[PDB]
Design a protein around this ligand. Structure first.
Ligand code: ADP
Ligand code: CA
Ligand code: CA
Ligand code: MG
Lengths: 363, 154
């Protein structure tokens, strides 16, 4: 019996088998339907046919907002990608912290009633990443396509009063890059064009160490500019958009949000913890997720938290090179442990208790 | 946000502690642990918690991860027991080993009612408390270690 580990990101499905060192299926969490109004396509193939499709993400800001399309995603994961029969496999799913309770209730219902899994668990993403880093104490900054959240953990227990969440992450950054590329005269508008700009962002963006200095550098010469070849063969040039786009993480007012930036939310989360554990949290900031992959982000985080923290505080940002997969890897490890599997919901328990049982078993 | 409407509403509760205490009852390695003053050591071996024989205590493979339970009498009562639990991560241990050692450290803490104080000990960064566990020349690092429990995805 081999458990399945499925980390349903807002933007990407990461799926595979417990005990593997990486997910075997990674593909966009998208359903595509004809742009002109056979019925639909999922994942990689929707991306492949995007020339004629309108693409929709069933998860927004870490929350499933289209349950019929999410069912298509899970079906595709089991039967078309992993090519497994879900009724044969205990399944571990994941969630961002501070999601509405009904999200995991419906996850539980669909896994048992539609896919007939024998057992399942819904894990908190940031906790899986902490264990993937080999720690029991630290503060995880997890940022994917949907959510940025801070989870301080002490001796293996998340501190719920100090968890922070920002519904600003990779997709918002892609949307903002689309917008500011119009200043150069480029027009990226459609759902398919959003995927092109997402690729530009991943390939060419970075976090400036000093934003105002970098803006001056960008105006003084072309030294920061990069070229990018579009699918139709046109070559565009981008300059200060490279770092203006992820600057939004530090200055959410770039997209009209009044929120604290990710450096301030990290600091605020630590400050909500008991004073005697704060030094351990400051020395163990663990980055997790695709939106933490910008070159320069760890250095910027180090600089900004140093400016907020007591002047003698020892601060360390841990940025695992595999952190696009840290959540999944933490799940692969925990799902390989018989004691962790002992806590999972069995099909019989679901039959007797219903969806509410997820809140009494999954922590 | 409203914690109470959310998926973290039950974190920090008695119920959470009860569920995790029950889970810790299903690990054979903890049975009989922490019953007298001394040092008990286990090594992670392909996700399993495996006892290290007492004749080897203080010798650690650089390729491996370990759990070290130090049981002692607290100042408050010479007839009772208190605990430091150290997990030791070799310089060359793999991610599955270190993550299992971290998780199972929490589990042993759960098993012992939350009483242990946890210490993360990376090779070359060991705490003063960890260095104090072994007699003069007692701490030795060994070449190699056991194979990862991970299957490598090509
Ligand atoms: N190198 C990179 N630089 C910046 N952003 C990236 C990079 N790689 C991936 N991303 C962004 O990270 C997000 C996907 O990361 P992932 O952790 O899988 O998210 P999720 O779990 O929400 O699906 C997308 O917004 C993607 O564009
Ligand atoms: Ca090893
Ligand atoms: Ca404890
Ligand atoms: Mg994610």
């Amino acid at each position: 019996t081999t458990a399945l580990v499925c980390d349903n990101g807002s933007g990407l499905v990461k799926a595979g088998f417990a005990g593997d060192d990486a997910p075997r299926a990674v593909f966009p969490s998208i359903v595509g339907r004809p742009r002109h109004q056979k019925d639909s396509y999922v994942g990689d193939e929707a991306q492949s046919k995007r020339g004629i499709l309108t693409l929709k993400y069933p998860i927004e800001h870490g929350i499933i907002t289209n349950w019929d399309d999410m069912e298509k995603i899970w079906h595709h994961t089991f039967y078309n990608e992993l090519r497994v029969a879900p009724e044969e496999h205990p399944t571990l799913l994941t969630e961002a912290a501070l999601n509405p309770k009904a999200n995991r209730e419906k996850m539980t219902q669909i896994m048992f009633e539609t896919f007939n899994v024998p057992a399942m668990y819904v894990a908190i993403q940031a906790v899986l990443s902490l264990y993937a880093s080999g720690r029991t104490t630290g503060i995880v900054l997890d940022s994917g396509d949907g959510v940025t959240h801070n989870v301080p953990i002490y001796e293996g227990y998340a501190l719920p009063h100090a968890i922070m969440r920002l519904d600003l992450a990779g997709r918002d950054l892609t949307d903002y890059l689309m917008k500011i590329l119009t200043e150069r005269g480029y027009s990226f508008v459609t759902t398919a064009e959003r995927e092109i700009v997402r690729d530009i962002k991943e390939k060419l963006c970075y976090v400036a160490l000093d934003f105002e200095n970098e803006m001056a550098t960008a105006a003084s010469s072309s030294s920061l500019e990069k070229s990018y070849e579009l699918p139709d063969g046109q070559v565009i040039t981008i300059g200060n958009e490279r770092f203006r786009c992820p600057e939004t993480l530090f200055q959410p007012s770039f997209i009209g949000m009044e929120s604290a930036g990710i450096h301030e939310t990290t600091y605020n989360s630590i400050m909500k913890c008991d004073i005697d554990i704060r030094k351990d949290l400051y020395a163990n900031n663990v980055l997790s997720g695709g939106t933490t992959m910008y070159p320069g982000i760890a250095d910027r985080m180090q600089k900004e938290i140093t400016a907020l923290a007591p002047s003698t505080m020892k601060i360390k940002i841990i940025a695992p090179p595999e952190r696009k997969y840290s959540v999944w890897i933490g799940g692969s490890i925990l799902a390989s442990l018989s004691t962790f599997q002992q806590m999972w919901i069995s099909k019989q328990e679901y039959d007797e208790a219903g969806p509410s049982i997820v809140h009494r078993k999954c922590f | 946000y409203n914690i109470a409407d959310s998926n973290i509403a039950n974190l920090g509760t008695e119920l959470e502690k009860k569920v995790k205490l029950e889970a810790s009852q299903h690990e054979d390695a903890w049975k009989g642990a922490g019953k007298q003053v001394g040092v008990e050591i286990w090594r992670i071996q392909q996700f399993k918690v495996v006892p290290v024989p007492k004749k080897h205590h203080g010798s650690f493979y650089t390729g491996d991860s370990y759990i070290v339970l130090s049981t002692y009498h607290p100042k408050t009562n010479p007839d009772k027991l208190a605990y430091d639990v150290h997990f030791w991560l070799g310089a060359f241990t793999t991610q599955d080993e270190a993550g299992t050692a971290a998780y199972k450290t929490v589990e042993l803490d759960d098993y012992l009612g939350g009483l242990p104080v946890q210490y993360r000990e990376v090779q070359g960064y060991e705490s003063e408390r960890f260095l104090s566990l072994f007699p003069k020349g007692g701490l030795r690092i060994l070449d190699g270690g056991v194979e990862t429990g991970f299957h490598h995805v090509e």
